[PDB]
Structures are given as C-alpha cells and as structure tokens.
Amino acid sequence: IVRPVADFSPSLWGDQFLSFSIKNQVAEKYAKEIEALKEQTRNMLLATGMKLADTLNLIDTIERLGISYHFEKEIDDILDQIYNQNSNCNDLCTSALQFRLLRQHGFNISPEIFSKFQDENGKFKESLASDVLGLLNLYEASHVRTHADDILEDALAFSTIHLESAAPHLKSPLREQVTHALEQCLHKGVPRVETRFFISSIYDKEQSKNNVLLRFAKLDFNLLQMLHKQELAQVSRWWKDLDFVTTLPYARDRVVECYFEALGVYFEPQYSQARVMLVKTISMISIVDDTFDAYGTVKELEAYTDAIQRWDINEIDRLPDYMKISYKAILDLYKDYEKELSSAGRSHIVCHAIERMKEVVRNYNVESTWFIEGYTPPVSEYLSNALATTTYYYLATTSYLGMKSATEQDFEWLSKNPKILEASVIICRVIDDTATYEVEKSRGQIATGIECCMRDYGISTKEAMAKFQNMAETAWKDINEGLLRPTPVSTEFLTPILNLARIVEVTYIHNLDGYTHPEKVLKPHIINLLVDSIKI
Ligand SMILES: [Mg+2]
Ligand SMILES: [Mg+2]
Ligand SMILES: [Mg+2]
C-alpha cells in the first residue's frame, strides 16, 4: 500500500531548546529584588486619594506590563469600588478605559457611559476625532462588547478611521502603540506576547515611565522566562525520547509551537504542572491528526478509532505497526497523568480528558469518511462534526488537569459544552476554515467549511467568508458575556477558554495557518518569549 510522501517542513529549532541550565545566582537575585519591587507596587495601588483617571491608568499599566497576576486581589477591590460608585468622568479616554477594565474583570458596567460622547443617532461625535488618547482607549474598549452593547456598534470603525489618520504624525512611542493596536487589539492578543511588546517597545521608551514598575516588569518577565525555558527543555527531552521524528516521519515536528500554545493558555508559575501536561496533549493529538489526514487508509483509521474507543492495552494487536507506536504512547501519557496527580488525590479527573479525546478521534474518522465519499454536508451538519475536530473541547478540558484548584464540579460544567466554551470552539473552527480554505480545497477536501457554506446557501467564496467572519464576531460577544458576573465557575477556569480564542486570533492573523507555517506567524513570538530575554 503506497502512501503520500511527507511535505511538512522539519523543525526550525533543531536542538536549541533541548537543555537549559538555570543560573540560580541570577534567579535568586531577581526573585529577591522582585519581592521588594512587588511591595513598592502594592503600596502604589493601595495609595489613597488617587483620582479616578490615575487609578485606572496605574491598573492598566500594571496589566500591560504583565505583572498584574501578583495583585489580583488589590486590583479587584479597586475595580469593584469603582464599579459600585458608578462615577462619571466626562473624559472619553477615562470612560473607555473604565469600561474596558471593568468588563474584562466581569463587572457589567453599563454602556450608557458612552452616550454623552454620541449624537442623536448614537453615532460618536466627530468632534472627538482629534483626541488621540480617547480614540485609542475607545478602540481597545470596542473589542469587549456583548450583545447588549449595540450603543458601541460604531466605536470600532470610528476610532479606526481616525487613529489611522493621526498615526503618521504622532510622537514616539505613542505612534508605535497606536500602529500596533490597529494590527492587534489588546483584548484579543496572547498576554505574554502583548506584555513583551509593551515592555520593550512602548513603556521602556516612555519619558513619563515609572522606573519601579519598568524594572519590576523586566525582572519578572525574564524570571518567568527561565521557568518556561526549563519546562520547554523538559518537554523537548520527553519528545526526543519518544522519537516519532524518525519512527513516524509523516507527522509534523512541532513541539515548540505546541509549547507556545500552552504558554498562551497560561504563563503564571503556579500553572507549570498544568502547562507541561497541556503541551504533551497538544503534541500527541497533533500526531493523531497527521495520521488521519496524510497517511492512514480507511481500514487502519477505523481500527484506530475503535481501538481509541475501547482504550485498552489489550487492543494494540489490531493496529498496523505504525499505529501501535502512537496508540501505546497515548495510553502511557494518560497513565503518566494519573500518577502525576495521585499525591494530590486528583487522579480521578483524567477520565474527562480521555472522553474528550475519544470524541476528537470519532470526528476525525467521520471527516475522513466524508472526504473519501466526496460528501459536502450542510453547514449545520458540518459544524456538528467539525467543531470537535478543532480539538478545542479537548484542550480546554486538558487545561484543567494540572490546575490544583479544579474540582469534579468544574469538569461537569465543562462537559455540558457551556456557551463560553462553544464560542471559543466556533472561533477556532471558522477562522481556521477561512484561512485554510484555498489550500485544502487544492487537496480535494470536498467537505471543507467554506465549501459546505457556499453549497448550502448558494453563495460565493467571499460571501461565505463574510458569514464565517460574523460567526466569529458573534462568538466573541458570547465569550465577553460569559465572563460577566455572576460567573458559572471561578474566573480561573474561564480565562483558559478565553486564551484559547486569543491563540486563534494570533495564529491566523491576516489569514495564514501559523501552526503549519510557523516561520511566518509563530517564529517571532517564540523568539521573543523563549529565546531573547528583555535587555535590562
Ligand atoms: Mg487536519
Ligand atoms: Mg484531520
Ligand atoms: Mg483546517
């Protein structure tokens, strides 16, 4: 039986991540100074008599510098008190910032704060077009809308057109901040990526900058980077010992891109165990996906699928030799997870991630069947299968495995496919289909999302892409609404789902697959997050 020959690119990275040896003198020096810098910062936040605008700017800056995770409780109290005071600044800049920060933290502040900035038709007063700081903060706020927020329906276009017009004549680094915002809004970016751009390209170059906060942010970023490098090295060794790069040469070699995805889901050190477990799943499921998409035949794929459903080390013998490799690796990985979680008494939650994996495999196989039969389903039927093949239900469930505070009840809410999770899954699916359409159509994938959408509604490739765009925008409103209090689970368990959607926006920016073409999209981010430290 002849196979299709491998056309995926080898790893850009070689061995450069395989061993990282932390300099503990540096590490312990950084940590000792950070503690002093941390407390000076706490006292800035707890300073009394601050005006509203200065308080929001302080919180905003600490968040953009990537250090707010040290002050979750302090920032919460301050925003809560601001929420309940329901103050009214007449400043567009302060109003838009107040709106965004509160909404991003779950406080359902009313969009009527923007009415004083609009005319009769609820269109923004064009006299505000010369207030660049107002437009910037309005622009960032325009991305955290829910469905109750149509008063803001004009904010994105209004702020965009005038930021575009003003940008070339702005001073630095404001000009670079505005230009970056137009390319990547804050709310939908990956946090470490935006933090690193803000520290090095913006705050470092601000004459007004606060030296305590800047030094804090540089040391903390570089200190956390040392941890991430340890994790990546330990994950690179685990991947090396598996050796699929030689035994399964059809498969993509992308463990570093997978680690970046895990790092976008959470970066804080308390999630180190959760991150390592997560990368291993993303890597492993990536292999299954290449098996289905570029190597196995119908009968091997059926035996693989059924073996996955039965999930028993008695079943290896039914698979061809190449499938025995991954199948045992999959089963081992999950026994590893169960052992990893035993000392905390949390081994019993691994079954939830396993059930989601079985679901992904079932739907991979359906997708193969559709490709072989030349079947083009209607959109609703396409989605019923293709949403799970994003892997995003699986990854979200996986993301909880290493989170020591995640309980059985948390997994039960997630098993019911809650609305915030569905929207994140929908964002991944429709953005991916828009970006991968023309290429996987060239490979004859008759059942690709845009195709189903054209055939179903009888519309052009362009009208189908616009329909998929609106599905993404609807999903972002649902994500944003799913973060508002009272939340159905702790916000700690919502942020990974939000971050999975951010990963989508960052990976397919301006519409190229970035995990399969990592050198265009993901390579600069991996260098900036995992190779180069921030120059102090
Ligand atoms: Mg695929
Ligand atoms: Mg596939
Ligand atoms: Mg695709």
Domain CATH code at residue 351? 1.10.600.10
Token code pair at residue 304: 């693989």
Q: How far is the CA of 368 from the centre of ligand 1 (A)?
A: 10
Q: How far is the CA of 364 from the centre of ligand 1 (A)?
A: 8
Q: How many residues does the chain have?
A: 536
C-alpha Rg value of the chain to the nearest Å:
24
Q: How far is the CA of 413 from the centre of ligand 3 (A)?
A: 28
Minimum-distance ligand to the CA of 431?
A: 3
Q: Are residues 231 and 173 in the same domain?
A: no
Resolution stated for this PDB structure, in Å = 2.2
Q: How wide is the angle at C-alpha 123 spanned by C-alphas 119 and 126, nearest 5°?
A: 80
- CA distances (Å), 426 to each of 95, 338, 497, in order? 31, 30, 12
Nearest CA to 103 out of 405, 502, 469, 476 is that of: 476
Q: Is 429 annotated as a binding residue?
A: yes
Instruction: Give the other-Cβ count within 10 Å of 4's Cβ.
Output: 10
Nearest CA to 98 out of 74, 85, 75, 82 is that of: 82
The gap from C-alpha 30 to its chain's centroid, in whole angstroms, comes to 28
CA dist., res. 11 & res. 9, Å (int): 7
Write out the residue range of the structural domain in which residue 315 sits: 1-48+209-535
Token code pair at residue 263: 């790092």
Minimum-distance ligand to the CA of 447?
A: 3
Phi, psi of 147 (to 5 degrees): -75, -20
DSSP H or E run through 449:
helix 449-457
Q: How far is the CA of 245 from the centre of ligand 2 (A)?
A: 19
Helix, strand, or coil (residue 124): strand
321-359 in b/e burial notation, b at 16+ Cβ within 10 A? ebbebbbebbbebbeebeebbeeeebeebbebbbebbbb
Q: Are residues 493 and 371 in the same domain?
A: yes
Q: What torsion, rounded to 10 degrees, do the Cα atoms 519, 525, 529, 535 define?
A: 100
Residues 6+ apart with CB under 8 A from 505: 188, 189, 427, 431
CA dist., res. 352 & res. 358, Å (int): 10
Number of domains the chain is built from? 2
Q: How far is the CA of 415 from the centre of ligand 1 (A)?
A: 24
Q: How far is the CA of 428 from the centre of ligand 2 (A)?
A: 15
Helix, strand, or coil (residue 118): strand
Q: Is 149 annotated as a binding residue?
A: no
Q: How far is the CA of 289 from the centre of ligand 2 (A)?
A: 5
Q: Are residues 38 and 187 in the same domain?
A: no
CA dist., res. 229 & res. 221, Å (int): 12
Q: How far is the CA of 504 from the centre of ligand 2 (A)?
A: 17
Q: Is 433 annotated as a binding residue?
A: yes
Q: How far is the CA of 368 from the centre of ligand 2 (A)?
A: 7
Q: How wide is the angle at C-alpha 297 spanned by C-alphas 295 and 300, nearest 5°?
A: 105
CA dist., res. 47 & res. 458, Å (int): 61
Q: Are residues 161 and 286 in the same domain?
A: no
Q: Are residues 198 and 229 in the same domain?
A: no
- CA distances (Å), 461 to each of 325, 386, 438, 453, 508, in order? 40, 19, 10, 8, 18
Per the rule left: phi > 0, alpha: psi between -120 and 50, beta: everything else, 379 is alpha
Minimum-distance ligand to the CA of 365?
A: 2
Cis peptide preceding 486, ω within 30 of 0? yes
Minimum-distance ligand to the CA of 428?
A: 3
> What letter represents residue 376's amino acid?
T
Asked if 1 and 27 count as a contact pair (C-beta separation under 8 A), the reply is no
Minimum-distance ligand to the CA of 288?
A: 2
- Residues β-bridged to residue 124: 118
Asked if 488 and 411 count as a contact pair (C-beta separation under 8 A), the reply is no
Helix, strand, or coil (residue 314): coil
Which of 208, 234, 269 marks a domain boundary? 208
Phi, psi of 124 (to 5 degrees): -60, 135
Q: Domain containing 107 — which CATH number?
A: 1.50.10.130
Q: How far is the CA of 317 from the centre of ligand 2 (A)?
A: 24
CA dist., res. 62 & res. 533, Å (int): 19
CA dist., res. 486 & res. 488, Å (int): 7
Token code pair at residue 208: 């007004």
Q: Are residues 415 and 353 in the same domain?
A: yes
Minimum-distance ligand to the CA of 363?
A: 2
Q: How far is the CA of 70 from the centre of ligand 1 (A)?
A: 39
Q: Is 306 annotated as a binding residue?
A: no
CA dist., res. 230 & res. 63, Å (int): 25
CA dist., res. 4 & res. 294, Å (int): 7
Minimum-distance ligand to the CA of 293?
A: 2
Phi, psi of 118 (to 5 degrees): -120, 160
Long-range CB contacts (within 8 A, 24+) of 490-498: 490/405, 490/410, 491/106, 492/403, 492/405, 493/400, 493/403, 493/406, 493/410, 493/414, 494/420, 495/266, 496/265, 496/266, 496/396, 496/399, 496/400, 497/396, 497/420, 497/421, 497/424, 498/420, 498/424
- H-type alpha helices, 346-407: 350-373, 379-386, 392-399
CA dist., res. 134 & res. 163, Å (int): 10
Q: How far is the CA of 505 from the centre of ligand 3 (A)?
A: 15
Token code pair at residue 85: 């005071």
Q: Are residues 89 and 135 in the same domain?
A: yes
DSSP string, 454-488: HHHHT--HHHHHHHHHHHHHHHHHHHHHHTSSSPS
Q: Are residues 137 and 162 in the same domain?
A: yes
Q: Are residues 256 and 170 in the same domain?
A: no
Asked if 465 and 149 count as a contact pair (C-beta separation under 8 A), the reply is no
Q: How far is the CA of 265 from the centre of ligand 2 (A)?
A: 23
Helix, strand, or coil (residue 286): helix
Asked if 357 and 308 count as a contact pair (C-beta separation under 8 A), the reply is yes
Which of 163, 183, 208 marks a domain boundary? 208
The gap from C-alpha 370 to its chain's centroid, in whole angstroms, comes to 30
Discontinuities after residues in the chain (C–N over 2.5 A): none
Instruction: Give the other-Cβ count within 10 Å of 52's Cβ.
Output: 17
Q: Is 432 annotated as a binding residue?
A: yes
Asked if 349 and 361 count as a contact pair (C-beta separation under 8 A), the reply is no
Q: Are residues 54 and 43 in the same domain?
A: no
Asked if 43 and 79 count as a contact pair (C-beta separation under 8 A), the reply is no
Locate tokens 């700081």: which residue?
A: 133
Q: How far is the CA of 432 from the centre of ligand 1 (A)?
A: 11
Q: How far is the CA of 322 from the centre of ligand 3 (A)?
A: 24
Long-range CB contacts (within 8 A, 24+) of 222-225: 222/30, 222/533, 222/534, 222/536, 223/27, 223/30, 223/31, 223/34, 224/267, 224/268, 224/269, 225/529, 225/530, 225/533
Q: What torsion, rounded to 10 degrees, do the Cα atoms 340, 345, 346, 351 define?
A: 90
Q: Are residues 467 and 409 in the same domain?
A: yes
Q: Is 220 annotated as a binding residue?
A: no
Residues 6+ apart with CB under 8 A from 36: none
Q: Are residues 56 and 40 in the same domain?
A: no
* Secondary structure tally for the chain: helices H, strands E: 23, 0
> What letter represents residue 273's amino acid?
Q
CA dist., res. 125 & res. 95, Å (int): 15
CA dist., res. 98 & res. 141, Å (int): 9
Minimum-distance ligand to the CA of 295?
A: 2
Which of 167, 183, 208 marks a domain boundary? 208
